[PDB]
């Protein structure tokens, strides 16, 4: 039941400074949690940056600072480079084990913020004949490459039968995401509407389909 919470996505401009927080659900993050920070650059292996709250790894520079900010573990990246773009995971030690925060994508801002084109598809008559139903929600042309996807049955949420893909870069360096909602034809034809809610940089795009 211990959950370690990290900001899903953070933006920073080349030269700018950004701070990433790490929260413990049991309370205050302390030196006893020996907070570590791990970096995963695109396509590359994981690399520990910080351990035991503020101990810098041999490759992590001085502009990278790890501390405790208001009952949390924090990681500051100063004078940011486009190379600093990666996924950052904190690991808190709880007595006998580590717990990893879900991770933060830090995007170094190199192109204008792009809004995603959301197109939601109902099941096909071909597929509904095969007694199967899949809602296909396709999200494309967004920057930064971080997106939040939610489904609704009528107006009430559903998180079951939902599988989403992590944003992937397109041919134009923008991002694309896909969500699918598995249902029985019986569930499909049972409701009046079916929605796919997409949140990007605090902005939510929504599409709705009906049986």
């Amino acid at each position: 039941q211990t959950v370690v919470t990290q900001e899903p996505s953070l933006t920073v401009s080349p030269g700018g400074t950004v701070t990433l927080t790490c929260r413990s659900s049991t309370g205050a993050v302390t030196t006893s949690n020996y907070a570590n920070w791990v970096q995963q650059k695109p396509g590359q292996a994981f690399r520990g940056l910080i351990g035991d709250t503020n101990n810098r790894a041999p490759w992590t520079p001085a502009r990278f600072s790890g501390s405790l900010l208001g009952g949390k573990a924090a990681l500051t990246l100063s004078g940011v480079q486009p190379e600093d773009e990666a996924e950052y995971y904190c690991a808190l030690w709880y007595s006998n084990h580590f717990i990893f925060g879900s991770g933060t994508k830090v995007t170094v801002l190199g192109q204008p913020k792009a809004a995603p084109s959301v197109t939601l598809f109902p099941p096909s008559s071909e597929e509904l004949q095969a007694n199967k139903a899949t809602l296909v929600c396709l999200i494309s042309d967004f920057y930064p490459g971080a997106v939040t996807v939610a489904w609704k049955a009528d107006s009430s949420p559903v998180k079951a039968g939902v599988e989403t893909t992590t944003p992937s870069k397109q041919s134009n360096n923008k991002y694309a995401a896909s969500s699918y909602l598995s249902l029985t034809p019986e569930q499909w034809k049972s409701h009046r509407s079916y929605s796919c809610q997409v949140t990007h940089e605090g902005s939510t795009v929504e599409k709705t389909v009906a049986p």
Partner: peptide, 9 residues
């Protein structure tokens, strides 16, 4: 065990 299980290096 605790220090050995937590060490960053």
């Amino acid at each position: 065990d605790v220090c050995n299980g937590a060490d960053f290096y």
